[PDB]
């Protein structure tokens, strides 16, 4: 529309001629336009730190369960009828034992997907992205040089995990295993461009099986390494030995493995595929994963048996069953809002309003709405403290999906020299205390988060004003979602996950 | 993928039936998910306000001009030897008289586009955007109820402006006029959706002609209504009636207009669009103008003759032409960084780093790079103050386009009752002092700004941290742009805007 | 009957898209329309329980 | 009986009949043997089908 | 070799051959390359293939 540009294309061509597409992964100085502005030292920001990795730290859940009408208890009955009665299984276990076995197999498979993602990341190098692979190895909690120096041992340990897992049987058509394996074994770009931001999913903990004999059967948390840990292969081997120590000597699990093998055949079982030296993972583009990560809503740290929570004596996360308690129901009723410290993280008050679910476009198909709400978990009531002096504030949900988000971990480069990698972990809620080195740090945090495209929505609590700000995101087509609607969607998605269609019903 | 959903499709159908497409322009209360949480009053943000209007407040510039070797003095020479060699005779004017006439014609055309947009906005209605049309009328500075009550007089005034300014001749082959008409006669969505957010361009000031007789000519600023001023038709009539007061029955202006009419024919003149009580502009999607908004870069308030600048005397913005100064050349070097007071607005220190040209995709053509940098203006040095004491800090650029951005104005809804329109005026740079109330207010402004898609990139300085934080914008394929590159691009675009295809 | 609904059918479509057919057998909490009303504890019935089985016990 | 839209199926109907619902799920084959043995033992006796007493009681008792 | 129907696999068969069953699990790559290095070093010597002594011993000591 400017006729001068077509009459002089050469002048326009040598006029612009700009660099365009700097490799991300390293610090970039912009320099000064006013050269005398070194007298205003910190008042001129010449830094440019583009982040690369946001790791979503999750816990695998069987859904919320406090009575026999839970989807996990209905699934326990539905799979026990197929294994025990429709296929003539053994009679030395109940339905809750079979479902606890089926839940421990999931933690086994998530560990396998985790270590093979560690394997496949360490072979990713490109000139356009200097975060590959080291920042992604840091976000998973390993020593990035151990996987380089001991690559063959890692590569054979992953295969040995997959071979040892063949000692147990678990149905393949149960979509719980497929969803957890697809979720914890993927690199996801946020934009589908050349040098995009990477999303990952790491387990915060796994579920460790514990036998109690007469007084039931537990699943306790086994903590996974966090992003600053620098764990070697020996640590992951000790973790895998700790995960299967209570499972290979158990005769109940041997009987249940034989029964699931007999009921579902050999081709109807979960098979962990073997990897080789040429096995590469590539970061794909998936708009459903991004629709999960946007509106993912973090619950906080898992509560442990050794965690000090004043006013909440026994409230550790555990999937329990007892034939005396709740007439043999599988019970997972966890408290949320814990952050690892014996105080109140009072930014969790910002999660006490109704959530916003915004999606791309205007279509909003039914399975798109059921997929975008998987990691969203709203609180319903406060937990009641046991006593008179309570330091934290714990919350009870209105149900949740098969995964809850514990927190997020963002890997970026440092603004100051020597520009190392920076690890910041955060909830959806972020408290900004009244100190000088909190406001510009939170602003760096916010600008690093908005580099990620379908990021989680942030809730910023300022302690100076005693005021939280609501959903810090750009909204396109949103709904205000209440707790009963999200509870209905959660019950649907958890019922679909534990459904086993290999049972030949008409249905 | 999931075999259970195909077995019970009615469950998945009825469980996920949610009302989407909430109308924007309203306050929405999300409610509580924890019913007890009313004891934690401001710690639970149950509020949701989406903004609708970001008005880019611009000033039309001729480019930077220090001497006769400037692009508009070269363009004055070019258009004067074109016009003089079709109108053979005894001309009573120079190059510079003709070019200052052609620059006053632009302020007239931008004023006509401004009041025509005021009329054409007032007929806009959408049930899903409640910002139409009162927020767009508040952002332009007009009282919205005055345009609805006095519609026929507004239409008569706009048709009379188009009839009076349309009596003068200006060449249509000069793309200066077409660019200013494309900015001024335009409603632009940031995304191609129905509940999109609106970008507008409004002149901060216009250039007012005054003939200095023997001592030359001058173009002085005439300020426009700012947002929330509730200006009536009588105020815009006063603005028009001192904009064209020196021009409307004038001898020399008629001679120059007749000369331009004989040089460039009737088909080669700038046309003015008329209104007929059905004229309605619609918000279009133009990613070329959104790239300029993304790389836009505010320079501050215009300096006037009445402005108090301690340590800076005689720094007012003017397109001056004196025959005894600079060999009779058109001179314009405005001083930037002024915000309307005497306190050294030290958010402007954050504009002393080099800029980031953010641009989407992976392939960037030469026209796209030369068009996206049009509202970008980087400071180069500090202006030297006259005196030991100096309250503000001013800056000199390395050139600028045919427009500079002075401000941005955001229109959203108030979260407190009643939910009227809130008006927020800001630069690219934003100072956050050490007070309790303005941290969450700056969060309100930041989240309001990120609702707009290709918004200008922000710089945020803090009081107690004593540091600015850099470009607050989601990046893409970017590049770091220096002052000499932007100066070359500004030279190219000031040359291309004022170019006339000549015969000589 | 109403000529405005035929002019803006998408507004009427999206404004009245509600999830019906709630499964029976569950407790449902309706919530509060007045957020302050938790100070009036049992005076606000936010509960909803639909029964399912009536067994006629005969001889 | 199972319906995802009625959570009273089947435990509420088993509680209303007086039976422990988990005992019927755990001991399904013995329950089926007991019911088939009741039908085989009581089916050894003769009662006239032209008496509508039996059909009315079967219509009430074998009915949801 | 792992299967749900036979809990002797593989540990009892590793015990019957006289190895630590956990060493072959924890050092699988080193075992796998030592076997190949044995097969490569044995190529330093020549022995006839049609002599059925080698075939019988190899088929006998490599079978379950």
From Swiss-Prot, chain C:
Extra remark beyond the main annotation: Picobirnavirus particles are capable of disrupting biological membranes in vitro.
UniProt PTM comment: The 7 kDa polypeptide is acetylated. Autocatalytic proteolysis releases a post-translationally modified peptide that remains associated with nucleic acid within the virion. This peptide is observed only when nucleic acid is packaged in the capsid.
Residues of the site described as Cleavage: 20-21
Function text: The capsid protein self-assembles to form an icosahedral capsid with a T=2 symmetry made of 120 subunits.
Residues of the full protein shown: 46 to 104 of 552
Origin superkingdom: Viruses
Subunit organization: Homodimer.
Protein name: Capsid protein precursor
């Amino acid at each position: 529309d400017v006729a001068w540009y077509a009459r002089y294309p050469h002048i326009l061509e040598e006029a612009t001629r700009l660099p365009f597409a700097y490799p991300i992964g390293q610090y970039y100085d912009t320099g000064y336009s006013v050269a005398s502005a070194t007298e205003w030292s910190k008042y001129v920001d010449t830094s440019l730190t583009i982040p690369g990795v946001m790791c979503v730290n999750f816990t695998p859940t069987p859904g919320e369960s406090y009575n026999k009408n839970s989807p996990i208890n209905i699934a326990a009955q539905n799979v026990y009828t197929y294994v025990r009665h429709m296929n003539s299984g053994h009679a030395n276990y109940e339905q809750a034992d079979l479902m606890m076995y089926l839940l421990a197999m999931d933690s086994l498979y998530i560990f396998h997907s985790y270590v093979r993602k560690i394997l496949a990341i360490s072979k990713l190098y490109t000139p356009v992205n200097k975060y590959f692979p080291r920042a992604l190895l840091v976000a998973l909690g390993v020593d990035p040089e151990d996987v380089f120096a001991n690559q063959a041992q890692w590569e054979y340990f992953v295969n040995m995990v997959a071979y040892r897992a063949g000692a147990f049987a678990a149905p393949a058509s149960m979509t719980y295993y497929e969803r957890h394996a697809w979720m914890s074994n993927g690199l996801y770009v946020d934009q589908d461009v050349t040098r995009a931001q990477i999303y990952m999913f790491k387990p915060t903990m796994l579920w460790k099986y514990e036998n109690l004999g007469t007084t039931g059967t537990k699943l306790v948390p086994l903590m996974m390494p966090k992003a600053g840990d620098n764990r070697k292969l020996v640590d992951f081997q000790v973790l895998f030995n700790n995960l299967v120590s209570t499972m290979l000597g158990d005769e109940d699990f041997g009987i249940m493995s034989g029964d699931v093998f007999k009921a579902f055949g050999a081709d109807g079982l979960v098979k962990l595929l073997a990897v080789d030296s040429t096995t590469m993972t590539l970061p794909t583009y998936d708009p459903l994963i991004l629709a999960q990560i946007h509106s993912a809503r973090a619950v906080g740290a898992p509560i442990l048996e050794t965690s000090t929570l004043t006013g909440f004596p026994g409230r550790q996360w555990q999937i329990t069953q007892n034939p005396d308690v709740n007439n043999g129901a599988i019970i997972f009723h966890p408290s949320f809002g814990y952050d690892g410290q014996d105080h109140e993280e009072l930014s969790f008050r910002a999660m006490c309003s109704n959530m916003i679910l915004n999606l791309p476009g205007e279509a909003h198909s039914a399975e798109m709405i059921i997929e975008a709400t998987r990691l969203a978990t709203m609180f319903q009531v406060k937990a009641v403290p046991a006593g008179d002096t309570s330091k934290p504030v714990l919350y009870l949900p209105n149900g949740f999906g098969t995964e809850v988000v514990n927190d997020y971990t963002m890997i970026s480069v440092d603004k100051a020299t020597p520009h190392d990698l920076t690890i910041h972990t955060f909830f959806n809620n972020i408290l900004v205390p009244n100190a000088k080195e909190n406001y510009v740090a939170n602003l760096e945090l916010l600008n690093n988060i908005i580099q990620f495209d379908w990021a989680p929505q942030l809730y910023l609590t300022y302690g100076i004003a005693q005021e939280s700000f609501g959903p810090f995101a750009q909204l396109n087509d949103w709904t205000i979602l209440t707790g009963e609607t999200l509870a209905r969607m959660h019950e649907v998605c958890v019922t679909s996950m534990f459904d086993v269609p290999q049972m030949g019903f008409n249905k």
